[PDB]
């Protein structure tokens, strides 16, 4: 658990990591007592009665936290990380403005806003193909009507709460783990 939450550096939204946790002593209530979590919503199971399991880790914006949920529509929910409707797990998120925010602008975190098809649940797209928005083809060269598929989050300490980084850890409960 600590190797996913207390990680030194997280991954981007489109390049969300996936940790297969097997053969473990799971203490699901070891972080519920931690009041450092601002968003904590379980969907497929009651939280207090939890006593393979995957852990998806990425960093999104402040307003994008509402999109990680079944049946949500948005830039992150359709082109970056989509959750199935019959989801069985929990979504944990907390503010990390004091970590992933340089004084001159932390442009290391990216996100995808250009894709010609919505992502399937638990789908990962690391495609750097130049998105064609116009009528004439691009042929791997960017320019007018040929934009880059990824965009950079701002992330500065003077940004609003809605535009601050939030580290999200999505737990998916798919008897090797109890």
């Amino acid at each position, epitope marked *: 658990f600590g190797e996913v939450f207390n990680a030194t550096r997280f991954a981007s939204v489109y390049a969300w990591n996936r940790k297969r946790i097997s053969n473990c002593v799971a203490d699901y209530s070891v972080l519920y007592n931690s009041a450092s979590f601002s968003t904590f919503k379980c969907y497929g199971v009651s939280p207090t009665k939890l006593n393979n399991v995957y852990a998806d880790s990425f960093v999104i914006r402040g307003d994008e936290v509402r999109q990680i949920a079944p049946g949500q529509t948005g830039k992150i929910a359709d082109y970056n990380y989509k959750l199935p409707d019959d989801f069985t797990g929990c979504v944990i998120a907390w503010n990390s403005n004091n970590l992933d925010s340089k004084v*001159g602008g932390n442009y290391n975190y990216l996100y995808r806003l250009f894709r010609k098809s919505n992502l399937k649940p638990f789908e990962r797209d690391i495609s750097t193909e130049i998105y064609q928005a116009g009528s004439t083809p691009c042929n791997g060269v960017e320019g007018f009507n040929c934009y880059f598929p990824l965009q950079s989050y*701002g992330f500065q300490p003077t940004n609003g709460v809605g535009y601050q980084p939030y580290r999200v850890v999505v737990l998916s409960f798919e008897a090797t783990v109890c």
Partner: single-chain antibody
Amino acid sequence: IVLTQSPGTLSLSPGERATLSCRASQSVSSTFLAWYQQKPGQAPRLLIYGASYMATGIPDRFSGSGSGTDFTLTISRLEPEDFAVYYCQQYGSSLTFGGGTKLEIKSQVQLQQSGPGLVKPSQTLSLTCSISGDSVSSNSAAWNWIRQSPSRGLEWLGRTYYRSKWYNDYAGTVKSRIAINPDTSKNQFSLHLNSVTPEDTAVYFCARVISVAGYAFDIWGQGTMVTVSS
């Protein structure tokens, strides 16, 4: 796309709120609406990129909002330092600047310009833009040339960038006589205007465009004044 800003002139006192607007003739589908601040005698300063994302060193007072055709720039608490003209820029199917709103109050990468400021008519205008802190052949960058005159405003001229090879993009207004050549050995890129007229008298700028930063001009140059006189 035609960007029409409103109001044209706004006079306020320190402490009040200035609500600026920028209406486009059609929808900016690429969502690359950028806001700039230009204090008198200086180059434009990137405030907001990509509809609402704030730039480097921009206080929380400046806030971007809007999408499609209506865009608003809301400055919460005004200071005497905010006396400047604010512009509106979009990228996508074209590269158009706004008319400008004159608001009156009652960093590691450096682009340095060089070249002559007095060119005779029917002669070539040459200006060089030295780059330090970033590579002129950067894969995620573009090197543009922009001029500013009270008759046309911020008029974008052209650009050059390097992916696998070198590519060009020129504005049809000056395409018949413009040339932008990069120099990798000196880490520069220069501007050439073949046949100049008194209409070309303006203040020219060179700026950097990062693709992941809303395709907005984030770091501008010194700003040289070229006069076409005989």
